[PDB]
Amino acid sequence: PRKVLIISAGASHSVALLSGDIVCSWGRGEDGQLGHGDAEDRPSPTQLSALDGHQIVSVTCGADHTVAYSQSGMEVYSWGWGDFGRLGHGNSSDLFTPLPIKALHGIRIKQIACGDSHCLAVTMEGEVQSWGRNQNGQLGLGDTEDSLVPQKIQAFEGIRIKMVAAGAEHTAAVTEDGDLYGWGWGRYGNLGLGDRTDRLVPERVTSTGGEKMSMVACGWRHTISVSYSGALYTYGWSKYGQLGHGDLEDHLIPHKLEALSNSFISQISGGFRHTMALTSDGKLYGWGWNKFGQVGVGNNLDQCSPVQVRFPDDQKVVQVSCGWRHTLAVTERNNVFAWGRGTNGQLGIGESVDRNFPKIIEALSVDG
Amino acid sequence: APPRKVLIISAGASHSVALLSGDIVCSWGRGEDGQLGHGDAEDRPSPTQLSALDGHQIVSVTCGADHTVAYSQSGMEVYSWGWGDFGRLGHGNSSDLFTPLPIKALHGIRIKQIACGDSHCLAVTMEGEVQSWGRNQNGQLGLGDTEDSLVPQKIQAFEGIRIKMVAAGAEHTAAVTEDGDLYGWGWGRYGNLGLGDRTDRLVPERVTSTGGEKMSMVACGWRHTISVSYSGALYTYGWSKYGQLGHGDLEDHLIPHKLEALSNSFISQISGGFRHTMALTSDGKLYGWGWNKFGQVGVGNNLDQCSPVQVRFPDDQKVVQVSCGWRHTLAVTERNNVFAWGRGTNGQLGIGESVDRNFPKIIEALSVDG
């Protein structure tokens, strides 16, 4: 088989980066998110030939679109649903095949994150450009006007940015010195600012306890951050227990998930109404909404606190990404697994009903 | 025996809903968020009776993007189901419903019409007042602010003003009064409010251009709006990236703009979809225009249409009813036949498993003919 480097799940689709700089995609294709030129669903992983030879180094999905970028090509590509300018091409057009974001050509890209209808990019210098829907200030540009092209977040002048993340309509960031910012839609307290108001510019979280943050990720209406100590924090919406605090209450400021204090967190991912966190010792913990089985624990009970996601022969997990109603994961033996809702083909195991525990994707896996 | 006849059809993002004689509600298409109301999450590619409403005396059904509402004149009850986020369901919580539940706030209220957009709804009472609930981030509820409402609330701006009907797009709303004034509010960035600018309104504001011409009806697509004047002239405004305003170009209009190509005809019904438009003439002729990628304009191809083209039906039967979804269209004829066209991946076409269809196809389960 071929070695899987990067995985990303969208609301209803999944995307992978293989060695060879090869992109493949599967799931719902109705909005063009798969990049294949047609609008049909794919129930099994499908190579995105248009990107062969472009030296893609990364891929990330928003809700109904996909972004990818190349270091050597110094290029960023986007395809999928076009409304609100989320693709960054200066028009609203849908794209059924990848296109370069001209604004981003030749810029040193450190990371891209995609939300429902907006994206951001962080440069090596630690600058942030954003584009797409901005009705609730989620671009962080001081206004409520949508932007069809990338614009610089001037509020970060003099503040170097490590990482950013994007939920449905809010955005979060961590600075190089470990500060946490949030802006955009905040009605569920998901900005971490201790209230339920929007921000049109980045605003600092001043409620850590002194804890500096190394990473951040968003689900739909909740946020997750990790400290330099490997401690996990969550905030925002907890109707479905996706904050994982053993209960169902909203948190307006970052809240440490003690249940996981005995481990060091390497990776985090937020989905629609659930959450995933991967420890340094290769154990995967999921929580939240489990109607479609997306938590992966072999049942369909919601989980208000972290619960270990089991794999065959206890193989260690090296990566995870949450869609809206599914989850994806890579293991040390280079197998790729998926679980949850399967109606759009997003599991990538061909024809399938929903799966409440992890299932191997033979096309990407060594094993069967 | 005789089929039941469709009394009412409505189309949502990717599902279809009908009311049949006998007060029977059925639905088909996408089921993932519970919009079908059968208590499960699977798509139905064929019409399926919503058993839970059997015996409830439903007189009308209306779809939003991924939700559905119905009501009962005699029982004086309004029911809703599907995606619950932002309170679009009206139950005072944000929980999804895979099965119809009564909107307790509307119990005992005489209901004249329901309109559903993406994540908001509005109801007009027989007395011609208007209540609304759901997402309100752009003031689409007309309540004065931008905070979502989990329960219906009365639009206070309409006191002293009787409402005939209302309409709702993705995040905007329009209404016409019992004497023909036209209003708009909510998300206004593409001019779809018809007020001459690209700014939201948090309360109903009267359209003053086309003010001289009165309006009998209004309908909304995603980001565009359609109205019919008392002389039967068709006006459109808002987004026309896909030619959905139908003016033979792709320009936006920030105020009502008359569609000349149809000046000769008298328009009796209108419908707005995701990126397409439908208009039914007084003599039973159906015209469609706009985005046609999945064949939803219904004119036998997949090329976009910036001007109105007549949709053709077997025997040139007359059409009496039409509803636009995002990527499909439904219509009822004078002969009691029901046709669907466009995208059918989620089963929204109602014709069993099928490829997409770019001209009308009869729905056998709800039709006289075949």
Swiss-Prot record, chain A:
Effect of a null allele: Hypersensitivity to ultraviolet-B (UV-B) illumination. Abrogated induction of DHU1 in response to UV-B. Disruption in a plant lacking DHU1 alleviates its hypersensitivity to UV-B.
RCC1 repeats by residue range: 1-18, 19-71, 73-124, 126-176, 177-228, 230-280, 281-332, 334-368
Result after altering W81A: No effect on function, homodimerization and interaction with COP1
Hydrolase in keyword set: no
One of the protein's GO biological processes: response to UV-B
Outcome of swapping W324A: Reduces response to UV-B
Cellular component, GO, one term: plastid
Keyword vocabulary terms for this entry: Acetylation, Chromophore, Cytoplasm, Nucleus, Photoreceptor protein, Receptor, Repeat, Sensory transduction
Cellular compartment(s): Nucleus; Cytoplasm, Cytosol
Major subcellular site: nucleus
Keyword Endoplasmic reticulum applies: no
Documented effect of changing W26F: No effect on function, homodimerization and interaction with COP1
Documented effect of changing W339Y: No effect on the interaction with COP1
GO molecular function: chromatin binding; guanyl-nucleotide exchange factor activity; identical protein binding; photoreceptor activity; protein homodimerization activity
Effect caused by changing G270E: In uvr8-5; loss of response to UV-B
Effect the entry attributes to changing W220A: Reduces response to UV-B
Effect in UniProt of substituting G189R: In uvr8-9; loss of function and interaction with COP1
Known partners and oligomeric status: Homodimer in the absence of UV-B, but absorption of UV-B induces monomerization of UVR8 and interaction with COP1. Interacts with RUP1, RUP2 and histone H2B.
Functional note: UV-B specific signaling component that acts as a UV-B photoreceptor and plays a key role in establishing UV-protective responses in plants. Upon UV-B irradiation, UVR8 undergoes an immediate switch from homodimer to monomer, accumulates in the nucleus, interacts with the photomorphogenic repressor COP1 and regulates the expression of the transcription factor HY5 by associating with chromatin (through histone H2B binding) in the HY5 promoter region.
Protein name per UniProt: Ultraviolet-B receptor UVR8
Source species of the chain: Arabidopsis thaliana (Mouse-ear cress)
Gene designation: UVR8
